[model samples]
Target: PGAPSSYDGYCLNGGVAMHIESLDSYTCNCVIGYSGDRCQTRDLR
Candidate 1:
């Protein structure tokens, strides 16, 4: 089990957003300084 809490955190940039999916998986839409599939990578921070 990892980060099972409904509460989640991410480096949201620009219009970036995140949401949890089935199988404890996460989905994110990155924008601006954010990168990576989940938008966790920070280009400017």
Candidate 2:
């Protein structure tokens, strides 16, 4: 089975964690006010 909890609570600042099976990892889809791999960076733009 795929790793479901590998990226649990990984996203921040209202970001959503999306799992990529090909990479066997996760990426954060940050909100408008945040930007970064984990959505930990604040983006004013």
Candidate 3:
């Protein structure tokens, strides 16, 4: 078993990790101008 804490610092490019308690997972909420699984890409739109 693993805690959501393991996902700490998982995000990149100024993204923030939002934990999904029900799924025991996390998602990267990227900041403006960034997009990707880890928010490591630029959003050119």
Candidate 4:
């Protein structure tokens, strides 16, 4: 097997706010920055 990503890390840039969004699988919702079906991908870092 391979090492699964602890969490999807996405560099979030929301004008005045910028941080790394950690989206955990099997969880409810994602943190920030990331988005989509499972909150994957970063908008703009």
RMSD of each: 4.4, 3.7, 3.4, 8.7
What is the alpha-carbon lDDT of model 4 when measured against the actual structure?
0.35
Tens digit per residue, CA lDDT, model 4, 1-45: 221343234223222222224542233234455555334454432
**The candidate that achieves the highest TM-score relative to the unseen native structure:** 2
| Best model number under lDDT | 2
Q: What is residue 31's positional error in candidate 2, in angstroms?
A: 0.9
> What lDDT is reached at residue 6 by model 1?
40
The C-alpha stretches of model 1 lying farther than 4 A from their native spots are 1-26
For 1-45, candidate 2 gives per-residue lDDT tens digits of 454566767777756777766575657668787886666886754
Clashes of 2: 0
Ranked by TM-score, top first: 2, 3, 1, 4
Candidate 3 TM-score versus the reference: 0.49
Superposition error at 44 for model 4 (Å): 5.6
Higher-ranked by lDDT: 2 or 3: 2
lDDT tens per residue, model 3, 1-45: 334656767777655777655564666667777777567785743
Q: Estimated TM-score per prediction?
A: 0.33, 0.51, 0.49, 0.24
lDDT of 1 by residue, 1-45 (tens): 433344356434542444445544455566656676445575664
